[PDB]
Scaffold this active site. Structure first.
Site, PDB file in Angstrom:
ATOM      1  N   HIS A 148     -21.727  -1.647 -21.807  1.00  0.00           N
ATOM      2  CA  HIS A 148     -20.605  -1.298 -22.644  1.00  0.00           C
ATOM      3  C   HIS A 148     -21.017  -0.691 -23.983  1.00  0.00           C
ATOM      4  O   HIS A 148     -20.193  -0.626 -24.882  1.00  0.00           O
ATOM      5  CB  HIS A 148     -19.698  -2.510 -22.901  1.00  0.00           C
ATOM      6  N   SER A 156     -19.035  -3.363 -14.493  1.00  0.00           N
ATOM      7  CA  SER A 156     -17.960  -3.999 -15.237  1.00  0.00           C
ATOM      8  C   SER A 156     -17.024  -2.871 -15.645  1.00  0.00           C
ATOM      9  O   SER A 156     -17.439  -1.935 -16.313  1.00  0.00           O
ATOM     10  CB  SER A 156     -18.522  -4.738 -16.460  1.00  0.00           C
ATOM     11  N   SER A 213     -14.118  -1.672 -17.945  1.00  0.00           N
ATOM     12  CA  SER A 213     -13.265  -2.035 -19.050  1.00  0.00           C
ATOM     13  C   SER A 213     -12.004  -1.149 -19.079  1.00  0.00           C
ATOM     14  O   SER A 213     -12.040   0.044 -18.743  1.00  0.00           O
ATOM     15  CB  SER A 213     -14.021  -2.017 -20.375  1.00  0.00           C
ATOM     16  N   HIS A 222     -13.866   2.838 -18.942  1.00  0.00           N
ATOM     17  CA  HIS A 222     -15.218   3.162 -18.536  1.00  0.00           C
ATOM     18  C   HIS A 222     -15.776   2.066 -17.654  1.00  0.00           C
ATOM     19  O   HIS A 222     -15.132   1.028 -17.450  1.00  0.00           O
ATOM     20  CB  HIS A 222     -16.127   3.385 -19.758  1.00  0.00           C
ATOM     21  N   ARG A 237     -18.397 -10.226 -14.725  1.00  0.00           N
ATOM     22  CA  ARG A 237     -17.561 -11.393 -14.660  1.00  0.00           C
ATOM     23  C   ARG A 237     -16.633 -11.452 -13.452  1.00  0.00           C
ATOM     24  O   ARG A 237     -16.216 -12.541 -13.070  1.00  0.00           O
ATOM     25  CB  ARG A 237     -16.727 -11.487 -15.924  1.00  0.00           C
ATOM     26  N   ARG A 238     -16.293 -10.305 -12.865  1.00  0.00           N
ATOM     27  CA  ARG A 238     -15.351 -10.286 -11.739  1.00  0.00           C
ATOM     28  C   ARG A 238     -16.072 -10.470 -10.428  1.00  0.00           C
ATOM     29  O   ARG A 238     -17.181  -9.934 -10.191  1.00  0.00           O
ATOM     30  CB  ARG A 238     -14.616  -8.967 -11.669  1.00  0.00           C
TER      31      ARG A 238
HETATM   32 CL   LIG Z   1     -16.727  -7.902 -16.281  1.00  0.00          CL
END
Ligand SMILES: [Cl-]
Ligand SMILES: [Cl-]
Ligand SMILES: [Cl-]
Ligand SMILES: [Cl-]
Ligand SMILES: [Cl-]
Ligand SMILES: [Cl-]
Ligand SMILES: [Cl-]
Ligand SMILES: [Mg+2]
Lengths: 218, 224
Positions: free
Chosen positions: A43, A109, A111, A128, A136-137
């Protein structure tokens, strides 16, 4: 030294909760993404190394296919490996990069933007995709490989229909031929940040296996 | 930003097999070392960050005390951590560095010269100590601290004789006040390298805890 492809589920419907869970409606509302959806590391801004070429609404969740085309990325990872890491193998610079990426950054990830009150979600929702060690998912593993076909191939539960739409749209993406040149020094820093921030993570290869089993990869 | 001290067992007698075992005889023969042993990061060359100030032949194995004093190391490591990494904790710069180093490079690995056929082990046998994630030998955890006597204190089975001998020799090392400069770029590269080379390692924290028990350092608990 030509491009790399990355693919995987951005989320899996009915598997997360709370703040994480993605809904069919919302996903449906959010495709096709309105603009270029960049791909970065962890990120970080000023750390774009590629772009999502397409995202599709597969039965199990939104699924994406990305290009990562940053020549220094390969320099920096190849420089880092010690001389006996590959034992007696001889690998192409492409193969080495694929392996190192796969194991250094095995997750993604997505976002999204925050929505204002009452504001219905639309094609502007996804911001992005970050490559990272653990997302986390549930089931957010990625596969990297030399062709978009090879990158998606290991996803056994990805519908045939979705795979077809995915590859077709990706072949027409404007970003597909693009290059991201980045300073070696800035990359080395971003990737060291990855390690330091995950240095205390326990049982990482067990959680990666779990993410693979979730995504449906052998 | 000052020097930090590092110490630990480089091996434990009888605790490894084959390639890895260091015998009493080999150690006896290899001490003291012909010249000063550098400390580097994960065996990379052109990345010395300190030096071994003294080694002794404790009953259980060879035990060392070293200094690390590379000024850029703190800045590189601190630049790497996310901004809420320490949450609410107020830490000095030195405490941040010791914490980050302790967890990034919790072990050591003594590297030896490869001998020619017919060549007996002598005082030139030992080449360097590398800081690393898990060393191949049993019990090779290290402890970092702001002083040498504090660096050595957690090793509850190190004999008092060896401990006194260690500190004395270190007190007269010519490397005691040295500094090891590196560019930020060269150091970032070397630290990334350790991450890459160790990324595949399984159960590292369980193996760390085991290495602590092996060496005789009160094992870190997480019961609270
Ligand atoms: Cl995530
Ligand atoms: Cl699309
Ligand atoms: Cl189908
Ligand atoms: Cl693991
Ligand atoms: Cl010595
Ligand atoms: Cl070792
Ligand atoms: Cl672990
Ligand atoms: Mg292949």
């Amino acid at each position: 030294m030509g491009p790399v492809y990355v693919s995987g589920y951005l989320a899996l419907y009915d598997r997360d909760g709370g703040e994480l869970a993605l809904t069919r409606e919302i996903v449906a509302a959010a495709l096709p993404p309105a603009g270029p959806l960049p791909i970065n590391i962890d990120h970080r801004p000023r750390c774009d190394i590629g772009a999502v070429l397409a995202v599709v609404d597969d039965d199990r969740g939104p699924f994406f296919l990305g290009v990562v085309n940053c020549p220094q990325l390969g320099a920096v990872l190849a420089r880092a490996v010690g001389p006996d890491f590959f034992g007696d193998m001889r690998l192409s610079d492409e193969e080495r990069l694929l392996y190192l990426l796969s194991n250094y950054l095995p997750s993604a990830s997505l976002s999204s933007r925050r929505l204002a009150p009452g504001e219905a979600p639309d094609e502007t929702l996804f911001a992005h995709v970050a490559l990272c060690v653990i997302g986390r998912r549930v089931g957010t593993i990625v596969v990297y490989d030399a062709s978009p076909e090879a990158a998606v191939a290991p996803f056994r539960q990805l519908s045939a229909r979705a795979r077809s739409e995915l590859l077709a749209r990706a072949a027409e993406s404007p970003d597909r031929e693009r290059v991201w040149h980045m300073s070696e020094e800035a990359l080395t820093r971003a990737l060291l940040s990855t390690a330091v921030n995950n240095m205390l993570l326990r049982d990482r290869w067990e959680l990666v296996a779990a993410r693979r089993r979730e995504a449906g990869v052998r």
